[PDB]
From a paper:
The crystal structure of AAC(3)-IIb represents the first molecular image of enzymes with AAC(3)-II activity. Its structure superimposes with RMSD 0.7 Å over 221 Cɑ atoms with the previously characterized AAC(3)-VIa structure, consistent with our phylogenetic analysis placing both these enzymes in the group 4 of the Antibiotic_NAT family. Similarly to the AAC(3)-VIa enzyme, the minor subdomain loop of AAC(3)-IIb contains the conserved Asn208, which is predicted to clash with substituents at position 5 of the AG substrate, thereby explaining the lack of activity toward 4,5-disubstituted AGs. Other notable amino acids in the active site of AAC(3)-IIa that may restrict the size and positioning of AG substrates include Tyr66, positioned near the binding location of the double prime ring, and Phe97, positioned near the central 2-deoxystreptamine ring. Altogether, AAC(3)-IIb—like AAC(3)-VIa—harbors a more restricted active site, consistent with its limited AG specificity. The crystal structure of AAC(3)-IIb features an active site highly like that of AAC(3)-VIa, consistent with the 4,6-disubstituted specificity of Group 4 enzymes. Finally, AAC(3)-IIb was monomeric both in the crystal structure and in solution (not shown). Insert 3 forms a two-stranded antiparallel β-sheet while corresponding to a short α-helix found only in AAC(3)-IIb structure. Representatives of Antibiotic_NAT Groups 2 and 4 were the most restricted in their specificity, and this was reflected in more constrained and smaller active sites, as revealed by the structures of AAC(3)-IIb and AAC(3)-Xa.
Residue numbers in the entry: -1 to 269
């Protein structure tokens, strides 16, 4: 039909390998998925149907008003602002649109929870929701201690619904743990909520999310996430298929992270 349905999307997910009980991190382009009856909310319903009440869904929500670049690497932050930057509120603050409209609807799903790192904020729904979303500290955006580390430890799977291979966020965790030199770092500041005296701008120091090494940080050229995912795809371990009208991928998170660490060691462990 012109519009896929909750049930037809659930069938496509199952055919791609999603199973009841799974922990799924989703990156979607809902335009690639195409019209579904009831819109993006019905895509969440289908995913929930696919993983059952025991499964957990997860998404990279971030924040539509994050001051990442405005505070990046000791930038003179322009107090022209006079600090009326909107506070990061877990329930009301918007998601970063670049990571997909679906994260807004995961947030609206029943009993969904959201992590407190404003720039790296994660949404999760299901038994593992609090486990995944707490703790989430400045300086632990995507690496050790982050929700990504626990997503990998709990056997998560990465679902791309028409999103490109560079959107595989769990490979930022592989970047963080890979025993190689010359890894790039950044610094920025975020409005925290500390000892309930409102906003306290606090500082983070973390690995660079836009290029872990110099050669991966060039514009117009593949970053490490894309480079590694493409190389991993050649093994034929992942699953591919259509969901709705979107070319889609399902990856085992432990395996692609382990591949990514191996890849980075074999290629950049020399310097
Ligand atoms: Mg369990």
């Amino acid at each position: 039909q012109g519009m896929n349905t909750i049930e037809s999307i659930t069938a496509d997910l199952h055919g791609l390998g999603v199973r009841p009980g799974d922990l799924i991190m989703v990156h979607a382009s809902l335009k690639a998925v195409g019209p579904v009856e009831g819109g993006a909310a019905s895509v969440v319903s289908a995913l929930r149907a696919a993983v059952g009440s025991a499964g957990t869904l997860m998404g990279y929500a971030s924040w539509d008003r994050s001051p990442y670049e405005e505070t990046l690497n000791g930038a003179r932050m322009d107090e022209e602002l006079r600090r009326r930057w909107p506070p990061f509120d877990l329930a009301t603050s918007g998601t970063y649109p670049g990571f997909g409209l679906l994260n807004r609807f995961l947030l609206e799903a029943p009993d969904a929870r959201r992590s407190a790192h404003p720039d790296a904020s994660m949404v999760a729904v299901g038994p593992l929701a609090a486990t995944l979303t707490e703790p989430h500290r400045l300086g632990q955006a995507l690496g050790e201690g982050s929700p990504l580390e626990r997503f990998v430890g709990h056997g998560g799977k990465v679902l791309l619904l028409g999103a490109p291979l560079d959107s595989v966020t769990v490979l930022h965790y592989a970047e963080a743990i890979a025993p190689i030199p010359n890894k790039r770092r950044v610094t920025y500041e975020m409005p925290m909520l500390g000892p309930d005296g409102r906003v306290r701008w606090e500082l983070a120091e973390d690995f660079d999310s836009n290029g872990i090494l110099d050669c991966f940080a060039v514009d117009g050229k593949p970053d490490a996430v894309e480079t590694i995912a493409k190389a991993y795809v050649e093994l034929g371990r992942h699953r591919e298929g259509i969901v709705g009208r979107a070319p889609s991928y399902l990856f085992e998170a432990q395996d692609i992270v382990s591949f990514g660490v191996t890849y980075l060691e074999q290629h950049f462990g020399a310097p």
